[PDB]
Structure formats: structure tokens, C-alpha cells
Structure 1
Amino acid sequence: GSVREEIESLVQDSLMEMVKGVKNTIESDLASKKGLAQSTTEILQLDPTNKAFAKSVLESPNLKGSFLAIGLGYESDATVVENDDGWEPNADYDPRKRPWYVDAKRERKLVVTEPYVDISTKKIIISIGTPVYQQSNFVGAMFYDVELTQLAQLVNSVNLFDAGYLFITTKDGVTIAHPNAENNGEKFSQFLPNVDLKEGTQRIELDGKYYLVKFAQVPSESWYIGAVVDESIAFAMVDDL
């Protein structure tokens, strides 16, 4: 179809635009925050076990203001130095079982985690994680919490034909941004069944309607951006003009 090849072309335009939106906001924020976390981690290995030192550094204003929260968890006694004014570890918190820590211990360098549920705010976030060494003795790890607010803002700022929207998922298809926020945390197949997670153009039927869907990857985070429109409506709009 020629009107249909135009629908697809337009969906592609918005999708590419949304991919550039993500890279220019979140992705460049992370790259900047990564430099901050890496250097903070290096400065702390000047004297890693000095908790007094560690706390002073994490409470310095700009650093404290660039992240949701920052902390250091120690391998020896599972304690936590952190800068979150309103949160304290409850007796059951073990830094070493948290994903920022596991990843950092495994990869042995700066790491960005997959999205996960924050214990402090119960929001879905990501963290920068770093290993801490004392002469190549691994003595603990750090988290630098980044919130995902900007994705929610991008995903609510765009309309497709008033008959479609964009959404964002992880590499395993867990939704992390969606105009209807109930769907976050869900695999996308819960609201968009019979769709594969892959680049390309897919066409489906759902509850008596016909939808066009296209995905694109954001390789650095391994996220997917989905665009989905009602194809009957979009056809009506393009033929009418």
C-alpha cells in the first residue's frame, strides 16, 4: 500500500526522533554522571576504609546534588556509608546482595545496572556501580542512583496521529516508560501481544483493531523504543490529506 508505506515512513520519523531524544538527554546525562562517579570512586581509594573520609566526600554539595543518592557498602561487615538524608538501612539490608554491588564485583569496573526497584523510594531506577579496591584487594562497591524521570517526560510529550504513542523497554522487554504508567514493570506483551522484540515493522490485530508497531534499539543502554499506531486511523488521516 502507498498510503500505508507513508504511515510506516512517518512512524519511522518519530521513532528516530525519539531515539535521538533519549541519547541527547538521559544518555548524555549518564555519560557526564559516569565521569563524576569514576573520579569519586578513584579519590576514595586514596583511603577506602576511612569511613569518615567517605562520608565527607559523599556529603559534598555538588556531588550530593547530582544524584538521587550515593553510597559505599563494605565487603567485610556489610555496612553502608551513604548520603540519603531521609533513608537509613533497615537491619535486613545487605549491600552485597544488591544489583549495583553484584555487577560491580563481577565486571571489576564502572557499571550501569538494568532498571530495578529502588529500596529507598520504591521507584524504578538505574544505578552506576563501581568496585572499590585497596591495592587490588576488593573491599566493597558503590552505588550512584539515577532516576528515570526524563524517560517518562519524553514518552508523555509525543502523540502519534492522536492514535498512537511511544514506549520504552529493557532488552528483555520489561516496560520502563509508557503514557499509562500501570504498565511499567510489565513485559510489553501484556498490553501488546503477538509482537516480537526486534527492529523492523510489525503489523498485528488486537481486540478488533489493527496496529502498526516499530522498534528501535538504544545500543548503549540496550533499551528498546516502541512506536505503535492504530493503522485504520492513521490511514484515515493520511488519505484525507
Structure 2
Amino acid sequence: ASIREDLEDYLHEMGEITASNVQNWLSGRILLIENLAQTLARDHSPETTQALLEQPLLGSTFLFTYLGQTDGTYTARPTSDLPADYDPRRRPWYNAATSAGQTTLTEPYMEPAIHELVLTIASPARQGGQPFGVVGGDLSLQTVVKIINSLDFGGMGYAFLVSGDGKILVHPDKDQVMKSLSDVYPRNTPKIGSGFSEAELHGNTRILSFSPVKGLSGLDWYIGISVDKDKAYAMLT
């Protein structure tokens, strides 16, 4: 009975190493948003706000870096054509940073300017006590998925980012973004947890593991790993 399933050890290690890569990837990028939010606290004048958002280290980092203020003032670099009714305080990155009260990440949404799926690192900007706005920075979803799948598999498996309640955040399949884990596998579903789960894909049988992304205070995000069950048993010696 050679039913030794190290596959179980492989999935839960690849899941944590991938989670650590995403954990380390957001390190510097959250650091850039915080340093910007802390700098706009001591001076948020329009001339200083303009030149603060034009530094090249933010240009090569985020698609858009911006500050939405409590009175509705909006400043963003690079400049883009936004809807006429654009109000930053009614945007998800404003509510996410406000409701979280700290540096947080938004669920993927549709960029209004370039019409591409993005994620925002939004941090509240406070002069101490009362806040005056929210600093944000957009990350292209195609860039994020590549970090999720930085580790190589044998074409048997892929990695994706799913939230705690089961909402898929980034997935290599562009149409399955923001779908629920229940919406993907109709036959009764896997659930986030320690255990491995077995479900069926489109003409394929998959095994799923879940390793949480630590370090993100307040965000219970998990790195999911679907692997082709039959393909997964590549035996050695």
C-alpha cells in the first residue's frame, strides 16, 4: 500500500513559499504608499502634492499614484481622463483605507481610466488625529498573478489569490476573477482551511490547498493552489 502522499506536503509548502513571495512583494510597495502618506501629512499643498506624486520610484511601481482628500480634492500622476462625476471619497480605495483605518489592499476592481483589472494599496493620510485624505497606488492584476505564479510547477498546478469568505481575487483565468469558490466548482465545494480538497475542473480533476498570507494585518487572504490530480503523481525512483 504505497499510499504515501507527500503531495500533501508539497502543496502546503508551495502554498506557504508562494504566500511568502507575495508577502515579500507587497513589502516595498506598501512601504512606498506609507512613506507617501506620512510625507503628505506634514505638507499636502497642491504644489507639494503635485511634485510628491511625480517621483520616478512611484512611476515604475504603480500604474497610478494619487491622493484623494476629505473635501473631494483629487491629484493623480500620471494625469488621466476620468469620468465627470469622479469623486475619490466614493471610490473603493477610499472606503477600504478608511474602514480599515490603516494600510490595506482593495479587492480587484475595474480601472475607470484604462479599463484593466487593478488592485490598490490605499493608506489613510493623517496629520495626527483627524485624517485629511487617502493615498493610493494601483497595481496591474497581470503583474500580481505573475508574482502568485513565480514558483514553477510541472504544468500540473497554478496558484491564485482567494479571500477568506471564498471570493477569488487574482486567478490566471481572467474570467474567474471575483468569482466565488462556490461559483467555480458547482458540485459541493472546497473550503479554505488546513485540509486539502478534491474537486473537478473543466474535464479535469484538481486538488486544492490553502496557505494564508500572513503579515497583512486585517486581510485574511489565502494563496490557493489547484493541481491536476492525475498529472500530480509524477513518480520518482
Category of TM-score, reference length = shorter chain: 0.7 to 0.9
Distance 1:209 1:41 in 2: 47
Distance 1:101 1:60 in 2: 22
**Higher mean C-alpha displacement, 168-177 vs 226-235:** 226-235
Tell me, which stretches of 5 or more residues in structure 1 are unaligned?
none
Q: What is the RMSD of the two structures over their aligned residues, measured on CA atoms?
A: 2.9
Tell me, which stretches of 5 or more residues in structure 2 are unaligned?
none
CA contact (8 A) 1:210 1:232 kept: yes
CA deviations 1:154-212 (Å, max 9, x no partner) are 4386445x554433312222223334332222113333342222220223467886543
Largest Rg, 1 or 2:
1
CA contact (8 A) 1:158 1:166 kept: no
Distance 1:70 1:183 in 2: 27
Deviation at 1:132, TM superposition (A): 2.6
**Residue equivalent to 1:213:** 208
Distance 1:32 1:42 in 2: 15
Distance 1:32 1:167 in 2: 21
**Residue equivalent to 2:137:** 144
**Residue equivalent to 1:174:** 167
**Residue equivalent to 1:110:** 103
Deviation at 1:57, TM superposition (A): 0.9
**Residue equivalent to 1:2:** 2
Picking from 9, 14, 17, the partner of 1:12 is 9
CA contact (8 A) 2:66 2:74 kept: yes
CA deviations 1:61-94 (Å, max 9, x no partner) are 2233322211111222x23111024x23321111
Corresponding pairs, count: 231
Letter in 2 for 1:213: L
- TM-score, structure 1 normalization: 0.79
Distance 1:82 1:126 in 2: 16
- Confirm or deny that 1:74 pairs with 2:69: yes
Superposed, 1:1-241 pairs within 5 Å as: 2-3=2-3, 5-6=4-5, 9-24=6-21, 26-48=22-44, 50-76=45-71, 78-85=72-79, 87-134=80-127, 136-153=129-146, 154-155=148-149, 158-159=152-153, 162-193=155-186, 194=188, 195-204=190-199, 211-219=206-214, 220=216, 221-234=219-232, 237-238=234-235
- TM-score, structure 2 normalization: 0.80
